[PDB]
Structures are given as structure tokens and as C-alpha cells.
Write a protein that binds this ligand. Structure first.
Ligand SMILES: Nc1nc2c(ncn2[C@@H]2O[C@H](COP(=O)(O)OP(=O)(O)CP(=O)(O)O)[C@@H](O)[C@H]2O)c(=O)[nH]1
Lengths: 117, 122, 206, 117, 57
RNA sequence: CUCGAUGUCGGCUCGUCGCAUCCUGGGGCUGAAGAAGGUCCCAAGGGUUGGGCUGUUCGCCCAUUAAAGCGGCACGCGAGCUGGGUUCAGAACGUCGUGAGACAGUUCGGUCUCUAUCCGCCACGGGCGCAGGAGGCUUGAGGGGGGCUCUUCCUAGUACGAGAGGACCGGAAGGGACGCACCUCUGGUUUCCCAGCUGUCCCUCCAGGGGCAUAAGCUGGGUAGCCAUGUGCGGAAGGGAUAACCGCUGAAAGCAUCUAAGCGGGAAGCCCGCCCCAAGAUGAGGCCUCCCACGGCGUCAAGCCGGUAAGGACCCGGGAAGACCACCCGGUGGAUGGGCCGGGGGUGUAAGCGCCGCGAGGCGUUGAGCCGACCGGUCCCAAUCGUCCGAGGUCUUGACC
């Protein structure tokens, strides 16, 4: 049965996509954001592909990721605001990085991850 | 593909192109009225007249639906389940019957008659 | 009669007048990395390696163990007895002739930890007239004053994947002397794109 | 390298093109002759017509059950390269949507419906 | 339902609590300032390797 | 022993030993021609089917089968199920009772709990050690796994044979059951891969989308991984001791006898050969390479500190390996992940504008569009910086320098 496994995640696909997005969005907002270990890791993979279309740069692409984040402010905000800033590298526009501590009650190890300038 | 208890189809001198087999005639440990095999059964379905009756013969395996995988990587499946009824020796039951060609059968061989007999479309 | 290999992947092919399926064996060519002379290891034999994973990475020891009769710059190595080295370097570019029968083995893909369910046969218990365990669960384990307790060696739940093993006879099918590869129609014993070996024994009188 | 590589290779070796015949088309009932034979090497250019159903794709591939109303429903599935083949000529139309395994056919077909497509 | 029988002494209790045991926390010095830094991390001072982007306010 | 407590049936699931062995073979015997039976001694090796009805195991019956054994273990199994059962009250009658009530007559229902401590089994690790300190390859004493068998065909109807009837030698061929791996192929899955759809509140009306319509609303298909019903393979040879049973040479029984003497024949069984563990077999470690005999301390320095990156651990990052853990490859003098990209294989021609129809939508640019684990490119991003522990490697004897 289980072992050889790809795209590894938690909670529930709907919950997840939910987050991936919400977050992708908030980061887009702040360039850099704070959450937990893989929150970042995978969020990287994702907000990741998004910036990918951000770059894509075109009526269509736009149409798509918008499909996913829903809201102009950012829509354009990214697509033109920074999408250029990046359009030229080889992806990996994500910088996921391990902070100094762990949230309370538990010691959940966290970090900041952002668009890698 | 197979079955023990079975509502199978035929089309020889059938009472009805249908009988229920108990099991496989092979190596004492049935579990598969399989393609091109020979097994046991009684009638399930009716029979206008016909010397057939509501008895039980044994016979040979036609069609199946769940992989007719051949030696030459010849491949097929008919959305049909049926074989031909036998009289002792194997020697088939009826004068004719409604169905046709394809390796597996003849290949099992012992039944050439079935062989030339069910040829054309259907 | 032995080949050392990096097991590739399984795939289908054709032979005579019919298709059938094979597997991809690949082996650069191990070499006399170490010899047990008999007076050396009266369990006389040949140990070899067959590739090379980065040099900047390599313990001194390795470096000189090699030094020995000196050969190359790899890490894949192991041994087998009663097998002369009518060479001091081997490939299979002939080493292993096709239309021959072989025996072979390899690492065994790593399962999981499933009980009466996995591990052993018979899929668990039953399901319906009873569901305070729905479908399957652990068989029985001994008894009152028979041995007066719990048994000692019947199959058991869990870890049953991280191991190794082999397959008896199989066919040598075909030899590709260039890209040191061979198609053999095999039980892909253990993964693929990983490690395996072949040996040939069978005074089998049909 | 690896898999992709080497293997790609061996197969290319044996199958070569399955005999350049690249006429797939979704629909199209069509007809061919496989060597399929036995009894005194009666390898017969046997031709079956069949309404195109599905397929496997990579080295080993197969022009799937194309169902054929013989007088009962018989569906024919056949490996692609499979040297087994000689003639393979289309007749029917490569039409209809939803893609293959559209057994809709073999199943509730009904000649009429059939044509309905 | 299955409440043991007694307690093989503190003895046992230990046997266990014991193999248990509490190890210590990994650390070297700030690639930047000083103090303890666990492998990949920054902190309320140095906070970097290429852009503190952190500490002081 | 047990009434401060031992759950009784039937069945289930996992079974374990046993031989008066059922099928297996080895056999002497026949009223044994052949074939086939039947008559005992040897030998448990594997094997020792489905249903029917019956709460019944037994049983009788259907169909096969090589065959479809008897039984040991509280008639194994409730800390592992099941609970028709017989055995708490009901109510039923049939039956006794003057009736209260009753019948091991019966029939309808009838609240089976379980967070493992111990020794025990299944796994996986942390020690500390098999008197240098080390990286890696082995050999196994000894232990574990599997050893079946059909039917046909081969020599088959020359053995026997008046005739009716049937081959040891032996040789095939496939199959069933079953065990071990494994996806190419075959088919099964695929909670997001793609595609179609109603209802609905949202975006901004229009399309173009968006959450809810159960942890994916519906539907139709769908890799890769894992997985049968798909694929390879296996149960051998063959070597040596023998069971019953067959013989050689030979007396004591100055003729004879396999029989203490000495020799041979012989079983699918016993040791090996077959794979899988394995010196924590303190009775190994055997071999390879390599740092130095490491450096300071009260001689007995078998303690300290650096010693060696000799090496490895730590943290990081990756893994069909994986509960943790240990195993495994890697850390930028890299490709390790994710990213990106080329490509496979998926979906089934997008979004828009364009062309025919009042319209519904139809056709074009479109087999486009969009994509997760599959081959592999390229430091785009993140594997920075560091830290610590780790010889001067048991006792003993003999030998050389
Ligand atoms: N190899 C071989 N087999 C033979 C020969 N003649 C006969 N046979 C075999 O022996 C069997 C007897 O021969 P057949 O001639 O048939 O018997 P028949 O003589 O006709 C009958 P009956 O013996 O009663 O007179 C046959 O089945 C045949 O297969 C021969 O010359 N060579």
C-alpha cells in the first residue's frame, strides 16, 4: 500500500487548497510571511506556481490564477506589480526560511518565507 | 470471467441457453469456470419441447468478459457468457448453435465440430 | 557464473512469434576489488564493485582498500564464493550469454506494517453478523494449559517490507553488449532503478 | 539517463515503429488483419472490423476493444506494435467527445443510439 | 480490566523512566553575532546570513 | 484443587502435535497373468475441495476428487470475534397439577465489558561488550522457509493373454491447489488529474470562474504508487547414512542360514544440496584498507586533555527504507529536494475573437487547453556558517626485529 508518495500534505484537500491560497494571497500582500515549517515548504511550492503565471503575463494566465485567488487588487497587484520584478529568473521565487522559535503551548517550529528578492 | 455457481449461457440444443454449473471440471479445486474449460451443470432456464430437459451435463467454456488473454498476445472480451453443452465424451450437444470463431476455442481443440460449426457473424 | 547489477526497470518485449515480457538489467562492469585467495579466505572467491558515486566524497580507507590491486573510483561493491576471476575486470558484454538460464536476486521493496491482513495470506476475519472488528483482524494465539500460554513463531503483524531476497530460475533472453544491459523477463525481484545481482545454478534434471 | 533512456532504447530496438500506422482516431469503427494463426501455420490476415474503443500508450500500447456486433456483442482488444499485425486500415470517423472507454457503445448501444453518437 | 499485579519496584519504574532519559539542545554560534544558533536559523540580534531583515525595533 | 468464582454448546479465525496413514510411497502375499483389487510391517512428507438441510460437530444428499483420515490440547481458542444454542422473568399451546406452578415437550423475542503490569510472541531500536582506534567485504557451526498431485500424452494395449483382459523400467505435456517476488501486459484504484451537470449565495450583469450542495455534491474516463482477477518463478536434481522388505561371503546347528563376523540392495523419510536469518555462536570474528602506536598526567599512566575528519556523530536536506528509531544518498568544489524546462501519460479541443441559426448552439483558430507522484536537463530557491566525540585498539603464550 503506502510509501512511495508524492505531493505530501495535511488536513483535508479542501481545507488545504483553502489555505495554500489564503496564504499565497497574504504573502503576495507582504512579500514575506510567518507560519509553520511545512506551511512554508508547500506554500512555497504553491504561491510558487502562482507567481509562475503572474509571470505568464497575459489575459489568459491572468484569468487563471485569478480563477484561484479571486480579487483584482492583488490580481493585477501581482501580475504587474512584481510579476515583472521576477519574469526572468528560473522560478524558485520562493525563499522558505526557519525562524528562531516555536509557537507556544506546543513549540511548533516556525519561520518566515517570502518572494525571494 | 469465472464462477462456481452459475447462471451461464449456451445455445446448443439447450433447454434454454442457460444452466447453472456447480464448478470446474479440472484439477480438484475448481473455483473457475474459465475460458475454454470444461465443467458441470443443470438447467436453470426453460425449454420448449426439445429432448434437452431440466437435467445436468458438463461441457465446454465459451466467452467470459474479463480478459481472454492469448498466447500470441491476441486479446479480446465479449459482453457475453456461454459455452456449449456436452454429451459424455464431450461430443457436443445440438446440431448447430448461435455464436462464432477465435483461437481459445479451437485451441483447446477437443471439439473441432464446435469449431467449424459456429462460424459467421454472431 | 555471476553478474553484478543496477537493476533498471521492467518492460514488455517480443520473442519468436509472440510477445511476452522482460526486465532491464544494467551493469557497467565490476572488477577484482578484492580476492579471497583461499589461502587468503579458504572460502575462496571474488568481491567487486560496478560503478562510481562521486570522488570528492571518499574515505581514505576506501581509497587505499582500492589502492590494493588498484581499480577505479566507485562505491557499489559485494562478494561471491566459488567463482574464478578469469580476468581482472568484468563487463558482461559477453559475460552473460543469452538463450541461457539464470537465477537471480535483489533488495526487496519495503512493505509496511499490516497484520493477519498483510504479512500473511488469508485476508483477515469476516464481516457482518459481527462488526466489533468489521471484515478483518488477528487470528488466535495458543491456549489454556496446552502449552499453557502464548505460542512462539506463527506469522505476525507489521514491518515486512524492509528486507531482501531472490528468485530461482529465470531466462537470460537478450544481451545488449553496448549499453551493458540485458533483458530477462524477471520477477523484478525488489525495486528497480536500484540494486540487484544474478548468479547461475541449476543441475536441474527437468 | 536511466529508465527513460536505456529502455526507450531497447524497445526502439525491437518494436521500432509499431509499423508507422499512426491512425488512432477516437471513434472510427475500422478494420484489420492480424497474423493471428494456428493449425498448420495458418497465420491468417484475419480482419475484424470494430468500433474504436481504447488504448495503452508507451513501447507496448494497444488499439483497444473496438466493439463489434457479431450477432452477440464481441469486443476486440489488440496490442499495437505487437508484430502480430499486418493490415490496419480505418473506415469510420474519428469523432465524438468524452474520450474513450465510451463503452456507452457495447453497453446500452442500440443501433439507433449508436448512430446517435 | 487488566490492572497489572504490583510494580517490580521503583526498580522497574526506573528501568523504564530510565531508558527514557532527557537529552540536550543542538547549537553553534551566530554566523553573524555570537550566541547559540541551531543549524539553519537567525534570531533577535544578528538574524541572517544575507540580510538580517530581523531584530531591533 | 475450584462455589471471594474455572464461560459449558455450534461456528468462526490462527491452529499445534499424534499415528492404530486416507492420498501419498516401500514393500513381502494372494485364491497375484495384465490391469485392477484386496492381505499385513515400514514411513507423517505435503497434501487431506464446493454446496444442500439441519444452531446440531455426526449425519444423509448433490458434484467432483489422488484423496476427500481418527484424534490429542478443559471436547484449543471471550482478555480474539460470533453468540442460533440449551439455561433468569415474558407469552404460546401441547401436558401434570384441585391450582398456585410445573415439563431435559416445544416454540417467538431474550442488555457478552475489556485503557496490557509480568513471563510469552511480532517487530524495531537504545547499551555495552566479543582489551589498538578505525571504513568495508565475507564464512558460516546453528537456526528458519518450501518439500503435493492430478489427468492426458510419450514406450501402450508386444508384459498376462486361448479368448473377454491389462505394462513394470521408464518417458513426456499441461493443469489445480499453494509459497516467493513483481507491473511491462491485463484489469482495480487515483479526495483534485482532466473532462460534463442541476441547485445555489458570491465576484463585478454577460459570459469566466467561486465556496455548498457528507471528511471530493453528481457523473465519465484517468496514470504514477500500491494492487488481483494480470506476469516471472518454485516445489529438482542430485550426494551419503537407512525403515519394512531383498541379497553376498560364513560358521556355532563336520548338509542348511542374510547372520554376531565382514559386504552390498533399498524407501516422496533423516544430514547435505535449495533459498532466509546468524558470533551478544563473549568460542571466531577471517580478509581488505587506514590513523597514529595520539597527547598529558604519581609505575602499574586499563584515568585526564588535544590528539586523527583515521572516522564518524550532530543539524540540514532528500528517500518505494520508514509509527519514533535505526537503514539509505546527499549538503552547494552539489543536482538533494522544491522550481523551472524539455519530455512521456493523462484528459478531450480551452479562454477569445472569428465565421451559419430568430434561438437553442454549430463550425474555425484547437486533437487545443490543463495538468500530482513517471525519464531526465538546468544552482531559479533552500542544502551557509558551525559542533562534538571519537587510537595509543583484552588476558596469555610462543616467534622474530
Ligand atoms: N509397430 C507395428 N504395429 C502393428 C503392426 N501390425 C499391427 N500393429 C498394431 O497391433 C494391433 C493389432 O493389429 P491389427 O491388424 O489391427 O489387428 P487385427 O488382426 O486386424 C484384429 P485380430 O488380431 O483379432 O485378427 C493394431 O492396433 C496395430 O496398432 C506392425 O506391423 N507394426
Amino acid at each position: 500500500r503506502h510509501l512511495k508518495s508524492g505531493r505530501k500534505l495535511n488536513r483535508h484537500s479542501s481545507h488545504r487548497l483553502a489555505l495554500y491560497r489564503n496564504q499565497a494571497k497574504s504573502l503576495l500582500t507582504h512579500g514575506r510571511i510567518t507560519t509553520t515549517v511545512p506551511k512554508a515548504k508547500e506554500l512555497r511550492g504553491f504561491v510558487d506556481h502562482l507567481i509562475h503565471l503572474a509571470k505568464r503575463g497575459d489575459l489568459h494566465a491572468r484569468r487563471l490564477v485569478l480563477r484561484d485567488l479571486q480579487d483584482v487588487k492583488l490580481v493585477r497587484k501581482l501580475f504587474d506589480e512584481i510579476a515583472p520584478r521576477y519574469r526572468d529568473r528560473q522560478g524558485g521565487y520562493t525563499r522558505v526560511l526557519k525562524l528562531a522559535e516555536r509557537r507556544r503551548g506546543d513549540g511548533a517550529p516556525l519561520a518566515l518565507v517570502e518572494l525571494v528578492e | 470471467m469465472i464462477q462456481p455457481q452459475t447462471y451461464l449461457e449456451v445455445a446448443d440444443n439447450t433447454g434454454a441457453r442457460k444452466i447453472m454449473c456447480i464448478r470446474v471440471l479440472k484439477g480438484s479445486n475448481a473455483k473457475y469456470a474459465t475460458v475454454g474449460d470444461v465443467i458441470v451443470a443443470s438447467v436453470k432456464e426453460a425449454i420448449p419441447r426439445g429432448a434437452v430437459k431440466e437435467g445436468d451435463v458438463v461441457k465446454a467454456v465459451v466467452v467470459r468478459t474479463k480478459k481472454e488473454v492469448k498466447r500470441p498476445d491476441g486479446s479480446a472480451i465479449r459482453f457475453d457468457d456461454n459455452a456449449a453443452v456436452i454429451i459424455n465424451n464431450q461430443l457436443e450437444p445440438r446440431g448447430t448453435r448461435v455464436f462464432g470463431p477465435v483461437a481459445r476455442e479451437l485451441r483447446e481443440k477437443g471439439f473441432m465440430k464446435i469449431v467449424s460449426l459456429a462460424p459467421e457473424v454472431l | 557464473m555471476k553478474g553484478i547489477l543496477g537493476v533498471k526497470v521492467g518492460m514488455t518485449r517480443i520473442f519468436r512469434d509472440d510477445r511476452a515480457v522482460p526486465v532491464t538489467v544494467i551493469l557497467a562492469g565490476p572488477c577484482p576489488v578484492v580476492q579471497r585467495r583461499t589461502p587468503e579466505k579458504d572460502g575462496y572467491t571474488a568481491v567487486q564493485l560496478g560503478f562510481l558515486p562521486q570522488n570528492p566524497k571518499r574515505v581514505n580507507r576506501p581509497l587505499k582498500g582500492h589502492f590494493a590491486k588498484a581499480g577505479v573510483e566507485p562505491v557499489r561493491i559485494l562478494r561471491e564464493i566459488r567463482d574464478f576471476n578469469p580476468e581482472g575486470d568484468t563487463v558482461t558484454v559477453e559475460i552473460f550469454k543469452p538463450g541461457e538460464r539464470v537465477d537471480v536476486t535483489g533488495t526487496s521493496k519495503g512493505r509496511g506494517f499490516a497484520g493477519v491482513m498483510k504479512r500473511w495470506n488469508f485476508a483477515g476475519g469476516p464481516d457482518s453478523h459481527g462488526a466489533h472488528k468489521i471484515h478483518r483482524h488477528p487470528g488466535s494465539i495458543g491456549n489454556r494449559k496446552t502449552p499453557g500460554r502464548v505460542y512462539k513463531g506463527k506469522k505476525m503483524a507489521g514491518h515486512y517490507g524492509a528486507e531482501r531476497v531472490t528468485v530461482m530460475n529465470l531466462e537470460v533472453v537478450d544481451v545488449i553488449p553496448e549499453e551493458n544491459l540485458l533483458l530477462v523477463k524477471g520477477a523484478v525481484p525488489g525495486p528497480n532503478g536500484g540494486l540487484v545481482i544474478v548468479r547461475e545454478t541449476k543441475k536441474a534434471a527437468k | 539517463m536511466n529508465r527513460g533512456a536505456l529502455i526507450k532504447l531497447v524497445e526502439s530496438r525491437y518494436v521500432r515503429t509499431d509499423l508507422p500506422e499512426f491512425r488512432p482516431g477516437d471513434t472510427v469503427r475500422v478494420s484489420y488483419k492480424v497474423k493471428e494463426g494456428n493449425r498448420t501455420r495458418i497465420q491468417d490476415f484475419e480482419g475484424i472490423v470494430i468500433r474504436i474503443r481504447r488504448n495503452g500508450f508507451n513501447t507496448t500500447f494497444t488499439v483497444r476493444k473496438v466493439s463489434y456486433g457479431v450477432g452477440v456483442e464481441r469486443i476486440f482488444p489488440l496490442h499495437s506494435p505487437l508484430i502480430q499485425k499486418i493490415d490496419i486500415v480505418q473506415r469510420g470517423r474519428a469523432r465524438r467527445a468524452k474520450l474513450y472507454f465510451i463503452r456507452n457503445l457495447s453497453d446500452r448501444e442500440i443501433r439507433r443510439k449508436l448512430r446517435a453518437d | 480490566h487488566p490492572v497489572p499485579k504490583k510494580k517490580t519496584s521503583k526498580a522497574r519504574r526506573d528501568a523504564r523512566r530510565s531508558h527514557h532519559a532527557l537529552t540536550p539542545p543542538t547549537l553553534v554560534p551566530c554566523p553573524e553575532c555570537k550566541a547559540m544558533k541551531p543549524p539553519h536559523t537567525v534570531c533577535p540580534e544578528c538574524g541572517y546570513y544575507a540580510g538580517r531583515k530581523v531584530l531591533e525595533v
